[PDB]
A = this chain, B = another copy of it.
Amino acid sequence: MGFEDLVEVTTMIADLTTDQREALLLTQLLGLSYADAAAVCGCPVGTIRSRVARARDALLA
């Protein structure tokens, strides 16, 4: 209704690339800084900044 939404959201997500979904989950579900996210993943901060930017465009298509 209601559930109709989260549903479709839940699926975007899942339509994200493995990387963007990881990046977004790290920074939003756990809510790590980009710094902490980048330590977890072992990449430049810029990398996460990017994966999340694109996750966000993806999700607001």
Spell out A's residues near B (CB within 8 Å): 1-3, 5-6, 9-10, 13-16, 18, 21-22, 24-25, 27-32, 40, 52, 56, 59-60
Stoichiometry, copies per complex: 3
Complex alpha-carbon distance, A2 and B29, angstroms: 15
- Alpha-carbon distance A22/B32, docked complex (angstroms): 17
A-side binding surface: helix, strand, loop or mixed?
helix
Q: Is the CB of A6 within 8 A of B2?
A: no
- B6-A18 in contact (CB<8A): no
- B14 adjacent to A40 (CB under 8 Å): no
**Contact in complex: B1, A5 (CB < 8 Å):** no
Contact B31 A60 (CB under 8 A): no
